[PDB]
């Protein structure tokens, strides 16, 4: 659940966090841990390509099995663990043959659940099936766009998608964004919705916490200089003072669509949203 | 629940007299028997009788109506109530309608009328007025 | 006369379309008990049975 | 459940056939209260059933008060057996 801190200090005032009750252990699997360096939004050229990133707490990557392609044996859910790299929690599961792995934690997952993958798997939380075998109306997550590539859609905390129907070699899916689109029927997905549904309600509370979470301060364009931002310059506070608000590189900010107009996927996108 | 069985008995008699019923029946008790016998000997009620059952007994009262079916009992009033007990000293014994009625009183000499109570020069608890 | 009591049946199967038909009109509407001669208890039981039959497709909802 | 009720009655009967008594009634009501507490914790919005729960609690309190007024030793023994306060 969400625990709200008493206003002992102005920094602590109005702050809330997660009690991490669902978390069972704080010992990550050494075998599945991999090193990660903080790129701080800088590419191989060393240029800052994405602003407002850098600093923060060191993290280790937990290899998540988004593919869920080990259909032979079931996996016993051993622990629900905190993952610094993603909003949702992860789950350490042991395969009966002795292979240990991580998966995204679906809502309602419990330690001891015996999860299965493959066309014959039952329609239960945590199981993985090809979309063709998932009955209409089912709630799913961890949907893979290309067969064998591994789940890509619906992976953030609390997200979910709904199966709406079949057509040809495609399955109709409503994604968390509300966009309705076709996805190749041979693609797999996990039954249920991503756990940690409460993540959105957390009130960060202070700047230092964002810094911990690796967000550097964001500067409004209206307070920069003319050569720095289109909104920069002017005496005192000023309005946008342009036909439309624009990004630092002149791209309009409000309402201007950026999706490629000749994108191939348009053929598969049935109804858009956002 | 019933809290004043004496007042209940008085009200039963009052209603039966009002509709001019010939008889009435009540759950029995020592105080009720005393009141019934007092009325019997004072001529307010034609007759009294008792039936033995397995709860508390029953007391049956045969009312008295004069020529032209005129009601002998004009009314009854409960004086001492559970909410407020009423006690009178010997001098304070009340006269009902200048004696045309009666006041049933419980005293250390037993349950008696106001006439008897003031003749003996003792007070008590004024159970009821009858007239 | 209450047909249910007359036939002396205390159980009303929702499958007995034969029985349920005499208690609905054309258009499939349920008849008032004042019209069908039946009592309140049997009327309620018939209502439940007919609704279940409608749900299971044994009786039509309309027409 | 009737079987559970009967077994409790047999356990707490003051004597053969003692269906009604402070001990028997209080024990049965305590078991009912526990079960209904579980039910309420499952369905916190079941105010209508919670009212019946409160009525049971009140009746059990009245019976306990009567038992204490009557025989304090039996009252103490009963509360010790049933784990009450």
């Amino acid at each position: 659940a969400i625990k709200k801190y008493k206003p002992t200090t102005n920094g602590r005032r109005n702050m809330t966090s997660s009690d991490f009750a669902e978390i069972t252990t704080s010992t990550p699997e050494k075998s599945l841990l991999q090193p990660l360096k903080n790129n701080a939004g800088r590419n191989n050229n060393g240029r800052i390509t994405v602003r407002h990133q850098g600093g923060g707490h060191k993290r280790q990557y937990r290899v998540i099995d988004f593919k869920r392609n080990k259909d032979n044996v079931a996996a016993v859910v051993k622990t629900i663990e905190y993952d610094p790299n993603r909003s949702a929690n992860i789950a350490l599961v042991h395969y009966e043959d002795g292979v240990k792995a991580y998966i995204l934690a679906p809502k309602g997952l419990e330690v001891g659940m015996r999860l299965v993958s493959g066309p014959e798997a039952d329609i239960k939380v945590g199981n993985a099936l090809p979309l063709e075998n998932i009955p209409v109306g089912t709630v799913i997550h961890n949907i893979e766009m290309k067969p064998g590539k591994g789940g890509q859609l619906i992976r953030s905390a609390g997200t979910s998608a709904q199966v709406l129907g079949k057509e040809g070699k495609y399955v109709l899916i409503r994604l968390n964004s509300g966009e309705v689109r076709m996805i190749l029927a041979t693609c797999r997905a996990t039954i249920g919705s991503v756990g940690n549904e409460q993540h959105e309600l957390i009130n960060i509370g202070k700047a230092g916490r964002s810094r911990w979470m690796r967000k550097r301060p964001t500067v409004r364009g209206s307070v920069m200089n003319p050569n720095d931002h289109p909104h920069g310059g002017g005496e005192g506070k000023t309005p946008i003072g342009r036909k439309a608000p624009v990004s630092p590189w002149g791209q309009p900010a409000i309402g201007y669509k950026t999706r490629n107009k000749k994108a191939k996927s348009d053929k598969l996108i049935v109804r858009r949203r956002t | 629940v019933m809290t004043d069985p004496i007042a209940d008995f008085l009200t039963r008699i009052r209603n039966a007299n009002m509709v001019k019923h010939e008889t009435l029946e009540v759950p029995a008790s020592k105080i009720k028997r005393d009141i019934a016998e007092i009325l019997k000997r004072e001529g307010f009620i034609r007759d009294v009788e008792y039936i033995e059952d397995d709860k508390q007994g029953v007391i049956r009262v045969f009312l008295k109506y004069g020529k032209n079916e005129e009601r002998v009992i004009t009314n009854l009033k409960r004086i001492s109530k559970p909410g407020l007990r009423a006690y009178v000293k010997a001098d304070e014994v009340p006269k009902v309608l200048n004696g045309l009625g009666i006041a049933i009183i419980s005293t250390s000499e037993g349950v008696i009328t106001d006439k008897e109570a003031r003749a003996k020069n003792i007070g008590g608890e004024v159970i009821a007025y009858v007239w | 006369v209450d047909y249910i009591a007359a036939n002396h049946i205390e159980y009303i199967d929702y499958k007995d379309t034969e029985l349920l038909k005499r208690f609905i009109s054309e258009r499939g509407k349920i008849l008032p008990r004042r019209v069908t001669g039946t009592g309140a208890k049997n009327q309620r039981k018939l209502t439940i049975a007919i609704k279940r039959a409608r749900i299971m497709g044994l009786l039509p909802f309309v027409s | 459940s009737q079987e559970r009720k009967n077994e409790i009655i047999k356990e707490y009967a003051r004597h053969e056939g003692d269906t009604g008594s402070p001990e028997v009634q209080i024990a049965v009501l305590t078991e009912d209260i526990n079960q209904l507490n579980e039910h309420a914790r499952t369905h916190k919005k079941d105010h209508h059933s919670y009212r019946g729960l409160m009525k049971k609690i009140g009746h059990r309190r009245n019976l306990l008060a009567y038992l204490r007024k009557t025989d304090i030793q039996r009252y103490r023994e009963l509360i010790q057996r049933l784990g009450l306060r």
Partner: protein
């Protein structure tokens, strides 16, 4: 225990072998979830009072079962019947 009647409609196009396998599978589910199937029988192939999932005919099959109320046999049957394609519709009702 409590007695339930489960009546469900099998899509008319089902093959005989498929129907037999389906009936056995669902009765097995009921048995495995701690419920005693006192009977299961194909009732009738009938016309529906209205179209259901594009069909106007259906095979009504009746399963009389008993179980403790707490037992999940009824819930599991409901879940799997809803998921399944062969069963157009189903209804479970307490009986005497």
């Amino acid at each position: 225990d409590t007695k339930y009647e489960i009546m469900y409609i099998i899509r008319p196009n089902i093959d005989e072998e498929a129907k037999t396998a389906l009936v056995e599978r669902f009765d097995t589910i009921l048995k495995d979830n701690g419920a005693e199937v006192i009977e299961s029988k194909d009732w009738e192939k009938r016309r529906l009072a209205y179209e259901m999932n594009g069909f106007r005919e259906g095979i009504y099959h009746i399963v009389n079962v008993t179980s403790p109320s707490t037992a999940g046999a009824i819930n599991e049957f409901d879940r799997l019947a809803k998921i399944n394609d062969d069963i157009i519709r189903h209804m479970i009702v307490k009986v005497e």
